[PDB]
């Protein structure tokens, strides 16, 4: 089970940044698994993006880039997207899906990745 | 909001040593760190969750302590890819957030 | 196969009083009924489901019990009862328990 | 706490926690009360079903001593002959589902004492800025 | 102090068993193809995607399939659709006419019983006064002989008229997420080994609930879902000889059957705008319809549930399985929908084995109605269309309904004879993990702390 | 009293009383306001007439000076010339049937004089705990 | 003013004013949120999807610090993010249309923060009514 | 919750005497009693109503008197079936409370 | 007109105590009149339990037995009913039914009353 990114990188400032995470092997629908979005440029340190449950509504996001930033996902085609609108030169950074276990509910689960997408932005 | 502070920042040892690197948070957060190991260009390998008990697929070569606010990770014996980045994370309130980023 | 034991078989007795008849299943828990017959005549229902009669029979009847021991009372014994008692579960039936005046 | 360590804070998520754990998420099950041919007239129904139930709690929650409070103190005092137990094993032990068979059969005892105590109070607020 | 203090708290989460309504979800994959073209399509809503189901801990919730509502409900529903579906087509009052008939072209053996009836009748045009003298090919569980000369009747007619389906609507069910209205939820069980009733202690609250598909069988409930590993019996309870044992098995039975009989479809018009369908012409080979099951997964899954059906009876105990005893025609078979045609199948060489405490393939004959009587009403048929082609589809076996033979006075072989009868526990396999639940909040519990005046 | 001597305390149970006595059975009337094919088109549309009367009458009371209060004291003075009667013989002798025909010619004056009265008060209050 | 020289109390009357112009006229934009074969099953499910959005309105004032209060004030600061402007040019300048269109990114955070801080503060009112 | 108290409690008197018993409350109730007479295995009889009318059947020969909380019985010429006990009951507020128990 | 009541008594303790009363003559139906169930252990006073209306809903009881006891009544029967659930031996008593005018309505009652039952709990 794999899991695979896609978009590509190169665009213009204060527009359409959009990535996408599916799944290979098995599927989104399986409960109580946190996904999340984390985001890091070469040279700067690891930033916070995006977290939420497998199971549930609510989703939740870094205060500090609410308003560029949005999230989404869907089980007709397994997506997990991550949308910004006016992008800056500070988005210019590699991106990683991630799926992490709860660890009250799940003894049993795999600890899963992205391998990290690199956007650049001029 | 609860922001995380971590020490040191840029280290270089030899081999066999035994490095340790504590981070400190805002707020008590008391039983909550998940510790995450990330090689160059790759993604983080998690070293361990709730900062006492280990993931599978990683050795006893790996430790993390405190209590409280103020934690601690040790590494024993020191193997050549330790050269990488680590950093502990919260997940006390909503957002998370990571380290400041440790150079090893 | 699940086989049933009355207590009292025959038994000849004095109006007025209250009576207790005891059946015995084999394995417990069951849905326990009774029924009223007399000689020559339509068997109709005491008591469905070990505690409740029926519609349109008199309140002096009652059932009681549980586990493998099930009790049925009647007290003010009239003079309309003297006929035979079978307990049973789904397929299988008592021997007859008889109530004669004497 | 939350996230990767966290028991769920999900709709009913905690049900079987102890009660100082759901003392916190308490607007979650609030908030999931209202939302939602012949199968019109059954669906019309359902949902006014629905908010004739809230609006009657809401009107049996506003004539004690809250409004829309969510979390209320009034001011009766608590009887030892409906629970006997101390506190710390009902806030430290004991599940909001057994709670709620412990004091079963004290209900509608306790609603009559608050309707007199909040009925009292109020001719006491009339009459104590009434006297001024 | 020690004087404690009642506080209300509102949203508490507790429930309490009761009784509602439930409310249809349905897929987005139902919509591309569109306008009652399959049912339920103008009845309710598509659903949220990926159902929030989320476990509970340390709560342990008795369940009950037996005494349980919402498969109730179901039952009153697919029924209310289905007249749904059959209030807009159109009557057939006029095909209730004499007829003349007789056999098909074939050649004749004096053992097989000829399964066609060629028959033609008069029938009405468009226009009232013209009439027109037509001919169709009929099945002979649908003909019966009025009283040289043979004139026939068709079977409901003394009954009455009834209802032609449209060939616009299909027949294959589209699973039915049900789902929870405000103000309740729904709970489900997720054991393993877990037959029906008492405390489950691994529950899971749901939004929805999963694929249901709601398939008409009285033997042999097919494409329904399966067990987690082993295979399991449940029943209301074993030694009542009246409920009956329903077997559910993990590993399903490949089940191919087929029509070989080639059909054209031939359309009469009744009057203005009544298209009546019949069968045409019978070309190729005329054969009969027969459902075929392979052997190593029957006699392995025949192993298996006399193994989980020996537990309950002793170990020193014979098994064997017979077919159906009696009644009419809809309990003997396993009946079965198939791609628009309706299948009545004589499963007596499946269930004929004993059992002792120590390329290959079965084959089995199948007719074929065209009236159906479904639920057994008095004043309704449905009439089925006849369909081109040779018709073939596969399925999946998973759970046999199973009901004893009164066994009695100490000999240990009790039989088990497979006849479904009553049509609600084909959906009970189905539902047997849910219950609904009313929330009553407004908890009442002390503390130490009093309201300032 | 209560019970072989009393006033009765029903539905509706003590409308010629003195308004005093009407006074405190004031819950009795509220909380009977919510409870209660073409047959369910009918019994549908009283259940939403009836809950749509109940929360005009929420909204009516919530825009004055109170929420949910059910004994609801203001700011503004009464006028003589609405009345002009003596405390004691309204508290004391008549009836609220009575009352609603003395004042219906009075009626939408007081309302307005409570939308102004509470939405001062609110400006008030929203500058007071402004300024500080 | 009123009258002759009036910017018009009317429905939604006022609704390219500045915002302190609109901080008066309030209530005529909520007691307009009530009122009001084939055809009676539309009518009633469009009467019942109002009152079910005016009951989802008045669930989430509630639990917020306000039961019904309709100018409500609570303890959340605000933050130089969301809008950069001074106090005079909103309540001076602007419209409440193009103050929705430039705040609309930021929401459904600041309906977060105020549900924390009236639980927050409604734990604080728990546990200070406690300890004395 | 209204607690009652009736005095005096065991009494034996000769015949054509007058007996005076009296009952006190918790709280002020000001015109609510009503007095009931219970013989030997029998339902009781009612006195009467409201501690100042009596009902029909009942003859001249028992009276109640007194006004607020204390109330006082006063039977002027007694009967060989006096022999009894005797009760008031309050009806002021859910819970009705009997007195405690004359014995005369 | 007689108030015929009925349930035999000799029990065990933490038991199904149930006792009916029941009028003849006349109807559980008539307005105005206080229905009241109220109990004597001889040797000791004697104890309210139950007491209602005749024509309304709302039901009352004595507060420090409340957990035991529950009142009923139904006019398809006429009966009027006490249940008391987990019984001590503080039961074994006489019980009496009993109809009392309300004073204030009614000027032209019947006083009623019960028999009263002996209960026996070992
Ligand atoms: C238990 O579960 C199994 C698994 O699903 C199920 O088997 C399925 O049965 C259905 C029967 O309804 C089968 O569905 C039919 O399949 C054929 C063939 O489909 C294959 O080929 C097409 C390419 O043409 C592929 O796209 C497809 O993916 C398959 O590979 C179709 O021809 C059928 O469609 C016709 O019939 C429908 C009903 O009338 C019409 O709505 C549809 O538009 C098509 O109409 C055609 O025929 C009409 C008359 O012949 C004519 O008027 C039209 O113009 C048009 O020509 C239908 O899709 C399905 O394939 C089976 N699944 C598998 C894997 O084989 C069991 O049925 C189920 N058990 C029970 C009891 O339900
Ligand atoms: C469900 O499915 C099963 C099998 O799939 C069916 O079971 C078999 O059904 C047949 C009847 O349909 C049973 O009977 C056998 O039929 C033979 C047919 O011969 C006919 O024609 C000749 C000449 O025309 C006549 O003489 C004869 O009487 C028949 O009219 C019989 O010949 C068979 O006879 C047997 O016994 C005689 C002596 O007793 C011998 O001479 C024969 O050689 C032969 O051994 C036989 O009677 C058949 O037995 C059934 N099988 C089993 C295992 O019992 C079910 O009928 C079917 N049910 C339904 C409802 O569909
Ligand atoms: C159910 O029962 C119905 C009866 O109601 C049967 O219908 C009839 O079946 C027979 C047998 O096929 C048909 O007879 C054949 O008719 C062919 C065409 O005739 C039609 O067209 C001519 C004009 O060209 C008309 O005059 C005539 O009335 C018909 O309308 C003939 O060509 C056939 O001749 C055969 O033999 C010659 C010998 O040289 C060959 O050269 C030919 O190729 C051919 O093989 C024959 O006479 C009859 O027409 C049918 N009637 C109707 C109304 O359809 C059904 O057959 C039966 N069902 C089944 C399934 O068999
Ligand atoms: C359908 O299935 C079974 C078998 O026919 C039957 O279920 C039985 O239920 C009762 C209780 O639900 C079980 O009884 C238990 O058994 C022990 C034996 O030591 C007893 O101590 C108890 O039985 C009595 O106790 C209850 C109080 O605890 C009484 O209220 C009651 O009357 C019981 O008689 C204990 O509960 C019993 O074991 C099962 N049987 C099996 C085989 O598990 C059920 O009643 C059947 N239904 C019908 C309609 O036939
Ligand atoms: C039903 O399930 C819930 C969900 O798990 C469960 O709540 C939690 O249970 C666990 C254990 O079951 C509790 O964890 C321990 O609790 C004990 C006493 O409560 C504490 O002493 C423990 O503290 C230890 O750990 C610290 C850090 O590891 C050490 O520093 C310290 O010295 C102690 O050794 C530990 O917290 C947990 O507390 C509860 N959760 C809450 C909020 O109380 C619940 O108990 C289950 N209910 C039932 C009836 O089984
Ligand atoms: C379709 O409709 C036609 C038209 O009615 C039917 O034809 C008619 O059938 C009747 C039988 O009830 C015939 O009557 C009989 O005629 C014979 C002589 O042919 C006579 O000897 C008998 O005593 C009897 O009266 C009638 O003649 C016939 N009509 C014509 C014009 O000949 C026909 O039966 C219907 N069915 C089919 C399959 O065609
Ligand atoms: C279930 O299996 C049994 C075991 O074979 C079936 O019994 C057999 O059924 C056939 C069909 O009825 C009997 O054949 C006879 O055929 C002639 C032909 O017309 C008929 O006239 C006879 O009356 C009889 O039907 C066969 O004798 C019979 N065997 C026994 C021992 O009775 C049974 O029919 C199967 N049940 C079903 C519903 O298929
Ligand atoms: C035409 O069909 C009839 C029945 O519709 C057949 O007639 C009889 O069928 C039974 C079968 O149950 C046989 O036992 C009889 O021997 C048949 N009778 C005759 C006279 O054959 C008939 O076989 C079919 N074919 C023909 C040419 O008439
Ligand atoms: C269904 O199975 C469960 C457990 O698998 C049974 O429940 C208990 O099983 C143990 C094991 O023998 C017994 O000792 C208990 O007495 C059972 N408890 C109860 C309440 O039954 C259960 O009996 C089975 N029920 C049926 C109908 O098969
Ligand atoms: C039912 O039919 C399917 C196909 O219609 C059969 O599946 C085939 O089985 C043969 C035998 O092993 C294989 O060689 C084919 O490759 C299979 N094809 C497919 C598409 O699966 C199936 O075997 C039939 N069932 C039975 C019991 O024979
Ligand atoms: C049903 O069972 C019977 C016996 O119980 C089977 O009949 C025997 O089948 C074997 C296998 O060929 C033969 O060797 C015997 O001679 C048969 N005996 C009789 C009396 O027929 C029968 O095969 C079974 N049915 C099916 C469809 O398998
Ligand atoms: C079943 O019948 C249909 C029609 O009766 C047959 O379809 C024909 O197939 C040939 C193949 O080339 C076409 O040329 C014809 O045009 C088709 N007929 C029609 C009317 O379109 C079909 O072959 C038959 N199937 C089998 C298995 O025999
Ligand atoms: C019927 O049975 C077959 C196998 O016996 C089922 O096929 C498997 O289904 C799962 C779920 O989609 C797939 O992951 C497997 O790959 C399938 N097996 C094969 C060999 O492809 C099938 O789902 C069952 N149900 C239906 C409706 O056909
Ligand atoms: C409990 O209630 C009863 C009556 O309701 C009362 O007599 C008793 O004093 C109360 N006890 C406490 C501690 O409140
Ligand atoms: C509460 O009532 C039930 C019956 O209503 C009874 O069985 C139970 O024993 C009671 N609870 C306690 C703690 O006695
Ligand atoms: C019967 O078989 C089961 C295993 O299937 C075994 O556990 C049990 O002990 C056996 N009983 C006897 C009496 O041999
Ligand atoms: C009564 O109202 C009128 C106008 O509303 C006013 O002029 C008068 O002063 C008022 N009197 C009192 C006593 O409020
Ligand atoms: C109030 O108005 C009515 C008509 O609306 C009128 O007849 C009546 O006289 C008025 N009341 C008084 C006290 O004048
Ligand atoms: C605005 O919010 C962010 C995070 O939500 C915080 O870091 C910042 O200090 C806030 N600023 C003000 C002025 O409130
Ligand atoms: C608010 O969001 C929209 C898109 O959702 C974006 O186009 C716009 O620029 C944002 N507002 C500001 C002030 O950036």
């Known amino acids: 089970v794999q899991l695979v990114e896609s978009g590509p990188g190169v665009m213009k400032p204060s527009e359409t940044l959009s990535l996408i995470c599916?799944?290979?092997?098995?599927?989104?629908?399986?409960?109580?698994?946190?996904?999340?979005?984390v985001r890091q440029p070469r040279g700067k340190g690891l930033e916070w993006?995006?977290?939420?449950?497998?199971?549930?509504?609510?989703?939740?996001?870094?205060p500090s880039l609410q308003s560029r930033v949005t999230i989404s996902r869907d089980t007709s085609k397994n997506h997990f997207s991550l949308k910004v609108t006016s992008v800056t030169d500070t988005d210019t950074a590699v991106?990683?899906?991630?799926?992490?276990?709860?660890?009250?509910?799940?003894?049993?689960?795999?600890?899963?990745?992205?391998?990290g997408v690199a956007v650049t932005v001029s | 909001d609860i922001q995380m502070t971590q020490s040191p920042s840029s280290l270089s040892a030899s081999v066999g040593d035994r490095v340790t690197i504590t981070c400190?948070?805002?707020?008590?957060?008391?039983?909550?760190?998940?510790?995450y190991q990330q090689k160059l260009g790759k993604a983080p390998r998690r070293?361990?969750?709730?900062?006492?008990?280990?993931?599978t697929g990683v050795p006893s070569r790996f430790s993390g302590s405190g209590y409280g606010t103020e934690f601690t990770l040790s590494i024993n014996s020191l193997q050549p890819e330790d050269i990488a980045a680590?950093?502990?994370?919260?997940?006390?309130?909503?957002?998370?957030?990571?380290?400041?980023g440790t150079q090893v | 196969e699940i086989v049933l034991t009355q207590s009292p078989g025959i038994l000849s007795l004095s109006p007025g009083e209250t009576a207790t008849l005891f059946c015995k299943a084999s394995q417990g828990g069951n849905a326990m009924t009774w029924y009223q017959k007399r000689r020559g005549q339509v068997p109709r229902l005491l008591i469905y489901d070990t505690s409740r009669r029926a519609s349109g029979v008199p309140d002096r009847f009652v059932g009681s019990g549980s586990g493998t021991d099930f009790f049925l009372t009647i007290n003010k014994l009239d003079r309309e009862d003297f006929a035979v008692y079978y307990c049973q579960q789904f397929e299988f039936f008592g021997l007859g328990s008889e109530l004669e005046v004497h | 706490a939350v996230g990767i360590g966290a028991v769920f804070l999900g709709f009913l998520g905690a049900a079987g926690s102890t009660m100082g754990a759901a003392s916190m998420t308490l607007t979650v099950q609030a908030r999931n009360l209202l939302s939602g041919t012949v199968w019109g007239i059954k669906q019309l129904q359902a949902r006014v079903l629905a908010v004739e139930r809230y609006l009657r709690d809401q009107q049996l929650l506003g004539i004690w001593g809250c409004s829309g409070k969510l979390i209320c103190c009034t001011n009766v005092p608590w009887n030892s002959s409906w629970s006997n137990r101390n506190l710390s094993e009902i806030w430290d032990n004991m599940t909001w589902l057994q709670w709620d068979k412990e004091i079963s059969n004290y209900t509608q005892i306790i609603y009559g004492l608050l309707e007199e105590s909040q009925n009292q109070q109020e001719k006491n607020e009339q009459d104590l800025l009434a006297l001024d | 102090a020690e004087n404690l203090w009642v506080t209300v708290y509102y949203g508490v989460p507790v429930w309490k068993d009761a009784e509602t309504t439930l409310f249809c979800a349905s897929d987005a994959k139902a919509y591309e193809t569109e306008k009652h073209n399959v049912w339920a399509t103008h009845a309710c809503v598509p659903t949220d995607p990926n159902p929030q189901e989320i476990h509970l801990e340390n709560v342990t919730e008795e369940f009950n399939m037996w005494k349980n509502n919402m498969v109730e409900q179901m039952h009153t529903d697919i029924i209310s659709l289905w007249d749904q579906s059959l209030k807009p087509c159109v009557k057939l009052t006029p095909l209730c006419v004499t007829l003349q008939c007789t056999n098909v072209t074939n050649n004749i053996t004096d053992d097989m019983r000829g399964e066609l009836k060629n028959c033609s009748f008069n029938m009405t045009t468009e226009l009232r006064d013209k009439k027109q003298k037509v001919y169709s090919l009929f099945y002979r569980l649908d003909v019966v002989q009025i009283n040289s000369n043979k004139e026939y009747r068709l079977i409901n007619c003394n009954t009455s008229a009834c209802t032609q389906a449209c060939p616009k609507v299909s027949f294959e069910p589209i699973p039915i997420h049900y789902c929870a209205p405000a103000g309740f939820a729904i709970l489900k069980c997720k054991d393993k080994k877990f037959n029906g009733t008492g405390p489950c202690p691994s529950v899971s609250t749901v939004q929805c609930t999963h694929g249901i598909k709601p398939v008409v069988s009285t033997q042999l409930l097919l494409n329904g879902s399966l067990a987690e590993e082993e295979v399991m019996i449940r029943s209301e309870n074993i030694t009542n000889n009246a409920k009956n044992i329903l077997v559910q098995f993990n590993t399903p039975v490949q089940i191919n059957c087929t029509r070989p009989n080639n059909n054209t479809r031939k359309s009469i018009r009744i009057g203005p705008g009544q298209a009546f369908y019949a069968t045409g012409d019978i070309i190729g080979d005329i054969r009969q319809a027969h459902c075929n099951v392979s052997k190593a997964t029957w006699n392995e899954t025949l192993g298996k549930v006399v193994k989980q059906l020996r537990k309950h009876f002793g170990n020193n105990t014979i098994i064997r399985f017979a077919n159906s005893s009696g009644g009419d025609l809809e309990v003997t078979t396993h009946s079965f929908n198939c791609g628009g045609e309706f299948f009545y199948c004589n499963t007596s060489g499946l269930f004929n084995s004993t059992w002792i405490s120590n390329n290959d393939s079965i084959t089995l004959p199948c007719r074929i109605k065209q009236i159906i009587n479904m639920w057994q009403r008095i004043g309704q048929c449905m009439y089925a269309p006849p369909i081109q082609g040779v018709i073939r589809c596969v399925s999946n076996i998973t759970g046999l309904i199973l009901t004893r033979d009164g066994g009695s006075t100490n000999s240990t072989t009790e039989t088990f004879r497979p006849g479904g009868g009553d049509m609600r526990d084909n959906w009970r396999s189905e539902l047997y993990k849910y219950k609904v639940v009313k929330i009553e909040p407004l908890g009442v519990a002390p503390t130490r702390c009093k309201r300032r005046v | 009293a209560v019970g072989i001597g009393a006033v009765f305390l029903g539905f509706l149970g003590a409308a010629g009383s003195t308004m005093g006595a009407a006074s405190m059975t004031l819950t009795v009337q509220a909380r009977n306001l919510l409870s209660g094919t073409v047959w369910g088109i009918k019994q549908l549309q009283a259940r939403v007439l009836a809950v749509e009367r109940y929360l005009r009458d929420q909204q009516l009371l919530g825009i004055w000076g109170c929420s949910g209060k059910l004994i609801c004291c203001t700011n503004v003075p009464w006028n003589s010339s609405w009345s002009n009667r003596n405390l004691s013989e309204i508290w004391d002798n008549m009836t609220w049937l009575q009352w609603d025909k003395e004042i219906s010619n009075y009626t939408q004056i007081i309302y307005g004089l409570l939308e102004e009265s509470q939405n001062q008060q609110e400006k008030n209050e929203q500058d007071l705990l402004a300024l500080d | 003013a009123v009258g002759i020289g009036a910017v018009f109390l009317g429905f939604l009357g006022a609704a390219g004013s500045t915002m302190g112009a609109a901080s008066m006229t309030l209530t005529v934009q909520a007691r307009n949120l009530l009122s009001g074969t084939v055809w009676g099953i539309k009518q009633l499910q469009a009467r019942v999807l109002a009152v079910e959005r005016y009951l989802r309105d008045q669930q989430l004032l509630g639990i917020w610090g306000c039961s019904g209060k309709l100018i409500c004030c609570t303890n959340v600061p605000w933050n130089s993010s969301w809008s950069n402007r001074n106090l005079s040019e909103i309540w001076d300048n602007m419209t409440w249309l193009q103050w929705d269109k430039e705040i609309s990114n930021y929401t459904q955070i600041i309906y977060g923060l105020l549900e924390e801080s009236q639980n927050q503060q409604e734990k604080n009112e728990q546990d200070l009514l406690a300890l004395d | 919750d209204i607690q009652m108290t009736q005095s005096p409690s065991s009494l034996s008197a000769s015949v054509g005497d007058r007996v005076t018993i009296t009952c006190r409350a918790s709280?002020?109730?000001?015109?609510?009693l009503s007095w009931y007479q219970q013989k030997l295995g029998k339902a009781p009889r009612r006195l009467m109503h409201?501690?100042?009318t009596l009902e029909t059947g009942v003859p001249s020969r028992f009276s109640g008197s007194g006004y607020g909380t204390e109330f006082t019985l006063s039977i002027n010429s007694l009967q060989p079936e006096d022999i009894a006990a005797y009760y008031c009951?309050?009806?002021?507020?859910?819970?009705?409370?009997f007195g405690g128990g004359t014995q005369v | 007109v007689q108030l015929v009541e009925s349930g035999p008594g000799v029990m065990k303790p933490s038991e199904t105590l149930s006792l009916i009363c029941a009028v003849s003559?006349?109807?559980?139906?008539?307005?105005?009149?206080?229905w009241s169930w109220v109990r004597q252990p001889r040797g000791k006073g004697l104890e309210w339990i139950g007491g209602?209306?005749?024509?309304?809903?709302?039901?009352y009881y004595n507060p420090s037995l409340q957990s035991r006891v529950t009142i009923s009544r139904d006019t398809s029967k006429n009966h009027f009913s006490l249940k008391v659930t987990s019984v001590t031996d503080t039961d074994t008593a006489v019980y009496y039914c009993?109809?009392?005018?309300?004073?204030?309505?009614?000027?032209?009652?019947?006083?009623?009353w019960g028999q009263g039952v002996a209960v026996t709990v070992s």
């Open positions: 209602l209306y005749s024509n309304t809903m709302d039901v």
């Open positions: 009993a109809r009392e005018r309300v004073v204030a309505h009614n000027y032209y009652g019947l006083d009623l």
């Open positions: 709280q002020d109730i000001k015109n609510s």
């Open positions: 003559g006349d109807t559980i139906s008539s307005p105005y009149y206080f």
């Open positions: 009951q309050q009806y002021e507020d859910f819970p009705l409370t």
């Open positions: 409201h501690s100042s």
